[PDB]
DNA sequence: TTCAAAAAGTCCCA
DNA sequence: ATGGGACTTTTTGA
C-alpha cells in the first residue's frame, strides 16, 4: 500500500514550491504532505529548509528574536513550525518520526505527524505549500462504503468512475494558503479522461496552474502499471494565466539520464510549450501551436461528427468468458444447438478495413429457455462455473439466472454490417465487419443511421478514419494509457468529426481496392501501403493541410 | 431495465 | 531476477 516515488522527482516537487521562498520575509511556512508515507518528500523538505535557515541565520538574528534564531535552533524550529504530514498507516508514520528525529532528551520536541483519513480530518488551518504523491484507488478496488461517503462529501469532483486521487486533488486545493504553491505526482489520466471532466473544471477556476509535466506512457514508477504526470498550481493573484506544459517525445528514456529533472525537461527528450487557461474549455487540449492549428482545421472543415451519423455500442460483457466462450475447435461444441453460437473476436483480431477470421465461439446463452430442455449444455460446459456465476451482481439480485450473460445487449445490433475498433490500440484500426461478428467490451462497434447512408458509406468511412491524418487527428485529443497504447471508447471516437466533398469517390474507390487487395488470399501487402499513401494525400488535399 | 467507463493494468519471457 | 512487450475482464455507477 506504499509507493517509492523517484527520487530526482521528490527533488523536482520540493524545488518546485520551495525554491523562490522567501525565508526573510516569512520563516514560518508551512509544508504539508498529507500522503506522506514514510516521508520521501518530507525528509527532503527539512534538507531543504536547514540549508534555508542556515544560509539566512544572522540576517533572521537581526530582523527578529536574537535568541531564538541560532543555528542550534532550526532543527526544533522546523519540527514545531513547518513541517506537517499525514498517513493512514500508522508504520509509515512512526518510521518517519524517528527518520525527523534523528536529523539533529533536551525538551521532547513535538512533531506535527498524523495517522489518519487525510480526506476525513478537520484541518485547523491551511498551508503554504502542498506536496507529494496520493494515493490512486479505482472504482474497482475502492470499498463501496468508502465511496458512499467520497459521493456525498466530494460530489464536486467525484462521481461515477471518478478516483480516489481526485478527492485528494480537492482536499490539496481547499486547504492551500492564499498565495501558496502545491505540487503533486498522479495519474495523467484526468486531463482528458470523461471521469475527470468535473476536477478539470474544479482545477481551472481555483488554482492558477504553473506547470505540467506529462511522461505520456513512460514507465516512472518501476514494476507498476501506471502513466504519471507532474502538476504544479499557485492561489497567488497573477494577471497572467498561462500554463507551462513538458510533454515528453520519447517514451524509452530513463528517468535518471541527468541528475535533475529539470536537465531532462529543457534537453531534447521533453517539448516545451504555452497553454492559455483562460482558453480552457471543459476539455484540455494540450498541444503545441502545429497541432493546434491543425485539429482546428480538423474541426472547422467537418460539418458531421460520428456521432451525428452512427450508432455506437459497447460488446457483450458475459460476466464469465470462461463459462461462454470457447474455441471453435472444442468438442464440446457439439452438445451446442448451431442457433446458440455466435462469432466470437478479440481486439487483436480487428485489423485496419477486415477482421481476421474468428477462432472463439460464444454460446449466447440468454435463449435457453429453461434448464430442463437443455441439461446437458448447462451441466457440461456454462455449470463448470456456476459458484462464480452465481457471484455476478444480477444473479444475486435475481435479475438474471445464473447461466444467462451478464449483458448479452441486442444480438440484432451485432448481426449486421458494422464497423468494429479495437478498446486499446497504438494506432486507428477501424475494420467493416461482414461476419456477423459478436466480441466482448475490448471492441466497440457501430453502424450508419439509416438516414445518413445515402452521404456516408462504410467503405468511405473506414478509409479515412484509418488514415494516417485521422490517426494523427485523434490522438491529439485521446486518451493516453499506457506505452503504445491509446483508449478508442466512444466517448472521444464518437467525436471525431468527418467531412464530405469532391474526394469522396476516390477515397472510397481507394478503400475498396485496399479491402479487396485484403481479402485475397495470395494478398500483396505492399500495394496496400501505395494506396494507402494517395488516400492520405487527397485526405490532406482536402482538409488543407 | 440496461447502458458504457475504468489501467498504482495483468501476464509472460528473456 | 527485472524490464519490456503483447494483449486485454467484469465490476460498477448511473
Ligand atoms: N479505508 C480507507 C482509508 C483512507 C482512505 C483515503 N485516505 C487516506 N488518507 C491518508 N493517507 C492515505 C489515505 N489513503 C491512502 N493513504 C496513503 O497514501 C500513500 C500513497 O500510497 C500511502 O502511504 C497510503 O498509506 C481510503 C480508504
Ligand atoms: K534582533
Ligand atoms: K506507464
Redesign the pocket.
Known amino acids: 500500500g506504499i509507493?517509492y516515488?523517484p527520487k530526482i522527482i521528490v527533488d523536482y516537487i520540493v524545488k518546485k514550491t520551495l525554491k523562490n521562498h522567501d525565508i526573510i520575509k516569512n520563516p514560518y511556512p508551512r509544508i504539508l504532505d498529507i500522503?506522506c508515507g514514510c516521508g520521501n518528500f518530507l525528509l527532503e523538505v527539512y534538507d531543504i529548509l536547514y540549508d534555508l535557515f542556515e544560509e539566512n541565520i544572522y540576517e533572521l538574528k537581526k530582523k527578529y528574536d536574537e535568541n531564538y534564531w541560532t543555528v542550534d535552533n532550526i532543527h526544533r524550529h522546523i519540527l514545531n513550525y513547518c513541517i506537517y504530514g499525514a498517513d493512514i498507516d500508522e508504520k509509515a508514520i512512526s518510521i518517519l518520526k524517528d527518520s525527523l528525529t534523528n536529523k539533529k532528551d533536551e525538551s521532547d520536541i513535538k512533531i506535527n505527524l498524523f495517522c489518519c483519513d487525510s480526506l476525513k480530518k478537520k484541518w485547523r488551518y491551511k498551508f503554504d505549500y502542498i506536496v507529494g504523491?496520493?494515493?490512486?484507488?479505482?472504482?474497482?478496488?475502492?470499498e463501496?462504503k468508502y465511496?458512499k461517503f467520497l459521493?456525498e462529501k466530494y460530489s464536486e469532483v467525484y462521481?461515477?468512475?471518478?478516483?480516489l486521487?481526485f478527492c485528494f486533488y480537492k482536499k490539496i486545493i481547499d486547504i492551500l494558503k492564499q498565495g501558496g504553491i502545491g505540487s503533486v505526482?498522479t495519474?495523467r489520466?484526468?486531463l482528458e479522461?470523461?471521469?475527470?471532466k468535473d476536477l478539470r473544471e474544479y482545477i481551472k477556476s481555483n488554482v492558477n496552474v504553473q506547470e505540467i509535466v506529462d511522461f505520456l506512457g513512460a514507465?516512472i514508477?518501476?514494476?507498476?502499471?501506471?502513466?504519471?504526470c507532474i502538476l504544479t498550481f499557485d492561489k497567488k493573484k497573477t494577471k497572467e494565466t498561462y500554463i507551462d506544459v513538458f510533454k515528453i517525445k520519447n517514451e524509452?528514456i530513463?528517468i535518471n539520464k541527468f541528475e535533475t529533472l529539470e536537465e531532462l525537461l529543457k534537453s531534447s527528450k521533453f517539448e516545451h510549450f504555452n497553454i492559455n487557461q483562460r482558453l480552457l474549455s471543459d476539455e484540455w487540449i494540450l498541444v503545441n501551436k502545429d497541432d493546434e492549428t491543425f485539429y482546428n482545421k480538423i474541426q472547422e472543415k467537418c460539418k458531421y461528427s460520428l456521432e451525428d451519423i452512427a450508432i455506437?455500442?459497447?460488446?457483450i460483457?458475459?460476466?464469465?468468458?470462461?463459462a461462454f466462450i470457447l474455441s471453435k475447435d472444442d468438442v464440446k461444441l457439439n452438445l451446442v444447438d448451431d442457433k446458440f453460437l455466435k462469432c466470437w473476436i478479440?481486439?487483436?483480431?480487428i485489423n485496419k478495413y477486415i477482421v481476421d477470421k474468428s477462432e472463439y465461439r460464444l454460446i449466447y446463452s440468454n435463449d435457453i429457455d429453461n434448464e430442463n430442455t437443455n441439461k446437458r449444455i448447462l451441466d457440461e460446459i456454462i455449470g463448470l462455473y456456476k459458484t462464480?456465476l452465481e457471484?455476478?451482481?444480477?444473479c444475486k439480485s435475481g435479475?438474471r439466472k445464473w447461466y444467462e450473460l451478464?449483458?448479452?445487449?441486442?444480438k440484432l445490433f451485432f448481426e449486421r454490417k458494422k464497423i468494429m475498433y479495437?478498446?486499446?490500440?497504438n494506432e486507428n484500426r477501424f475494420a467493416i465487419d461482414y461476419d456477423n461478428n459478436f466480441s466482448?467490451?475490448?471492441v466497440?462497434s457501430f453502424f450508419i443511421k439509416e438516414e445518413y447512408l445515402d452521404k456516408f458509406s462504410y467503405e468511405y468511412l473506414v478509409g479515412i478514419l484509418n488514415s494516417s491524418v485521422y490517426d494523427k487527428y485523434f490522438k491529439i485529443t485521446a486518451?493516453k494509457?499506457?506505452?503504445?497504447?491509446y483508449?478508442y471508447?466512444?466517448?472521444?471516437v464518437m467525436k471525431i468529426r468527418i467531412f464530405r466533398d469532391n474526394n469522396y469517390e476516390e477515397i472510397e474507390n481507394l478503400s475498396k481496392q485496399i479491402i479487396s487487395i485484403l481479402l485475397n488470399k495470395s494478398i500483396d501487402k505492399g500495394k496496400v501501403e501505395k494506396l494507402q499513401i494517395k488516400m492520405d494525400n487527397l485526405i490532406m488535399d482536402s482538409l488543407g493541410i
Open positions: 509507493y516515488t500522503s504523491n496520493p494515493p490512486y484507488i479505482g472504482h474497482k478496488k475502492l463501496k465511496k459521493l462521481k461515477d468512475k471518478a478516483d486521487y505526482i495519474p489520466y484526468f479522461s470523461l471521469s475527470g514507465n514508477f518501476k514494476n507498476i502499471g501506471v502513466s504519471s524509452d530513463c455506437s455500442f459497447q460488446g460483457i458475459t460476466g464469465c468468458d470462461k478479440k481486439s487483436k483480431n462464480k457471484n455476478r451482481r444480477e435479475i451478464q449483458w448479452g445487449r441486442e479495437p478498446y486499446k490500440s466482448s467490451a475490448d466497440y486518451k494509457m499506457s506505452k503504445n497504447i483508449d471508447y466512444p466517448n472521444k
